[PDB]
Amino acid sequence: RVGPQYQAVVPNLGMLVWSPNQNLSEAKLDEYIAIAKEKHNMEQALGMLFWHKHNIEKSLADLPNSIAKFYYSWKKTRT
């Protein structure tokens, strides 16, 4: 169909959850993530590190500080 109304009429406000850190080393970041997981998820640790302006030491110091997953868990268990 030609769709004269259907045809398009031709003429960021985004929350940065995580960003890469050039200064931080990949091995250091992996070790920090593993330590956080052992002591206190990977996404949560990455967000905590990002909130600290990419400070591994500060993040480690502050580390101890119908409806919407639940349905998919039952399917995974049944598998």
Binding site: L16, V17, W18, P20, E43
Partner: peptide
């Protein structure tokens, strides 16, 4: 992407 490790290299945004 969280478990393979590539998530660190990419910029992750939250859509509005």
């Amino acid at each position: 992407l969280l478990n393979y490790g590539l998530y660190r290299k990419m910029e992750i945004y939250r859509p509005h």
